[PDB]
Amino acid sequence: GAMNSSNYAELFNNDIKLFVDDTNVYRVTVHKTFEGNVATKAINGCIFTLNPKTGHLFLKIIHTSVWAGQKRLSQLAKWKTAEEVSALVRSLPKEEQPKQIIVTRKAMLDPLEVHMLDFPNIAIRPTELRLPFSAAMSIDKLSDVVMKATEPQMVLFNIYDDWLDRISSYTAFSRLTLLLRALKTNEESAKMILLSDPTITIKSYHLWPSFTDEQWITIESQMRDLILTEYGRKYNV
Amino acid sequence: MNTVPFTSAPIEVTIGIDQYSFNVKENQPFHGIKDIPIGHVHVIHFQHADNSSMRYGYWFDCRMGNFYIQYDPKDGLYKMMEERDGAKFENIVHNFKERQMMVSYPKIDEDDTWYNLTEFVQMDKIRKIVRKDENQFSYVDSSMTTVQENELSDPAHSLNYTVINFKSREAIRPGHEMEDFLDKSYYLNTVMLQGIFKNSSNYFGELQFAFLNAMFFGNYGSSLQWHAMIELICSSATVPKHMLDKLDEILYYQIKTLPEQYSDILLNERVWNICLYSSFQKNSLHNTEKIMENKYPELL
Numbered sequence: 001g002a003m004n005s006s007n008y009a010e011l012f013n014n015d016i017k018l019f020v021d022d023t024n025v026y027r028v029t030v031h032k033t034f035e036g037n038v039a040t041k042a043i044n045g046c047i048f049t050l051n052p053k054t055g056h057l058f059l060k061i062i063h064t065s066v067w068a069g070q071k072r073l074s075q076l077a078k079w080k081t082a083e084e085v086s087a088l089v090r091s092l093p094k095e096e097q098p099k100q101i102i103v104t105r106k107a108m109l110d111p112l113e114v115h116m117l118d119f120p121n122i123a124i125r126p127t128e129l130r131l132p133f134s135a136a137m138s139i140d141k142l143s144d145v146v147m148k149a150t151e152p153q154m155v156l157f158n159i160y161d162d163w164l165d166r167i168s169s170y171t172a173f174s175r176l177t178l179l180l181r182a183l184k185t186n187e188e189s190a191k192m193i194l195l196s197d198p199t200i201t202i203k204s205y206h207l208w209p210s211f212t213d214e215q216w217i218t219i220e221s222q223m224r225d226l227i228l229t230e231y232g233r234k235y236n237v
Numbered sequence: 238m239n240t241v242p243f244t245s246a247p248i249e250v251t252i253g254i255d256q257y258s259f260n261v262k263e264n265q266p267f268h269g270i271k272d273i274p275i276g277h278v279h280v281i282h283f284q285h286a287d288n289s290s291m292r293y294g295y296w297f298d299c300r301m302g303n304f305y306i307q308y309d310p311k312d313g314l315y316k317m318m319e320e321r322d323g324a325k326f327e328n329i330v331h332n333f334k335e336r337q338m339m340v341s342y343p344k345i346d347e348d349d350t351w352y353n354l355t356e357f358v359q360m361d362k363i364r365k366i367v368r369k370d371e372n373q374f375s376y377v378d379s380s381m382t383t384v385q386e387n388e389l390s391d392p393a394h395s396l397n398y399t400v401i402n403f404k405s406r407e408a409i410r411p412g413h414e415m416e417d418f419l420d421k422s423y424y425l426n427t428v429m430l431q432g433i434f435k436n437s438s439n440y441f442g443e444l445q446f447a448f449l450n451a452m453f454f455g456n457y458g459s460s461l462q463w464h465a466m467i468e469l470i471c472s473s474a475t476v477p478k479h480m481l482d483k484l485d486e487i488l489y490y491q492i493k494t495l496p497e498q499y500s501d502i503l504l505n506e507r508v509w510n511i512c513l514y515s516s517f518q519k520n521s522l523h524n525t526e527k528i529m530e531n532k533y534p535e536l537l
């Protein structure tokens with residue numbers, strides 16, 4: 001069924017699962033035409049597919065050429081996502097295939113269920129969590145590879161860097177959602193927080209800075225403060 | 238004109254014959270139904286005065302044999318039987334019609350209702366849906382489940398309707414997942430019409446049979462089947478023009494005949510609103526939309 005706070009430890013058990021987020025698949029800029037009408041121009045996008053236990057991120061880049069000459073792009077994008085997820089599963093050895101795929105928006109259920117009819121033992125599930133994965137494009141290295149791509153391409157990352165050497169997957173996931181929620185609520189402040197200190201750097205093979213245990217607690221506290229802040233500024237509290 | 242005689246009516250019962258019905262009181266001198274129009278299937282059905290639980294009944298075609306009803310006090314129901322020797326069957330039926338012990342099937346001459354509800358229903362196809370081959374007539378009741386209901390218990394007492402499932406490998410071609418899911422024309426026309434039903438008359442006959450079992454017995458699996466078969470047509474972008482026109486006529490008479498007080502349970506709000514207002518065929522069911530909107534505007 002659906003995925004919520006009562007079964008949240010399930011994400012970190014030993015059944016392979018993937019989250020699929022389609023919020024950045026179809027991306028547009030809206031602008032005025034010479035005649036004073038409005039038109040859209042698409043820009044590259046991505047499917048964000050993540051194993052929450054391992055941190056493995058299967059980032060499928062959606063090049064704008066996949067929309068050329070297509071109609072009803074918002075609907076096509078859900079089916080394109082499902083096709084790519086199905087192709088990914090099929091590419092994985094059987095022992096690496098997920099037992100569950102959890103979609104962050106309910107509109108993906110039918111498209112993915114249809115594309116995975118071949119896989120009746122794989123459960124397709126929604127979630128009641130409001131996960132902040134749409135902010136994935138605020139991670140500079142991810143945004144850079146999407147915007148530079150000249151063709152469809154799959155790029156693999158670990159979204160937890162080396163964190164699992166020191167913390168559990170539950171704590172790594174919680175850190176990730178806090179960081180992404182902050183970037184979603186106020187990207188400038190979140191980024192200032194993360195990079196203010198010039199002595200903490202991002203290793204070439206990582207996405208986030210190389211914080212010690214102590215500095216991650218400071219950082220985590222500052223991100224909570226930010227998410228409290230903007231919540232006041234937003235609601236005047 | 239043919240006759241369904243009764244040995245007796247030992248228990249009080251409401252008797253249905255097609256869309257008509259009348260009450261028989263316990264041990265009332267009733268010996269059956271006469272003047273039944275030849276040329277159409279028929280259904281004779283029962284609801285006991287004591288136990289409204291279990292509506293039940295028999296689909297039959299008078300051209301296929303000489304049938305009578307005998308109450309069975311062990312199984313507790315009115316059973317349809319077959320008389321082998323036609324000579325003796327005629328000796329009894331005449332004797333009773335002389336003593337005027339029968340209700341007359343009450344067809345109005347302006348009324349084509351029964352015809353319009355059973356146009357495509359054939360007894361040979363009923364017997365494939367209801368598997369009990371040693372009888373030329375077919376028993377149905379309220380509680381019988383469908384083959385698909387047994388997949389989601391007794392297989393012998395099931396309704397073997399054609400399984401329709403929009404999220405199945407049969408409904409969806411590899412590589413056209415989106416196309417086939419949003420426009421069901423492949424499943425309707427290639428899989429079902431050409432592959433399984435052979436023609437639209439057999440498709441419409443199953444649809445009509447499913448509605449009648451829903452309406453007369455409150456059979457829930459039949460109601461699901463009727464809606465499924467409507468939805469598959471309405472959700473197909475490419476449907477022969479003559480099927481659409483006939484569909485509109487079929488549904489119009491079904492909606493016309495439906496008891497107003499049963500609409501809440503027999504009509505699926507989602508299917509009808511989708512079909513009339515959202516689907517590829519939203520503009521193709523003029524008669525049906527007009528009657529639905531004037532008779533059941535609540536549902537919409």
Ligand SMILES: CNCC(=O)Nc1cccc(F)c1
Pocket residue numbers: 242243244305306320325326329330
């Ligand atoms: C018991 N012998 C069989 C039998 O009763 N047959 C029959 C035939 C016609 C009408 C009827 F009421 C009964």
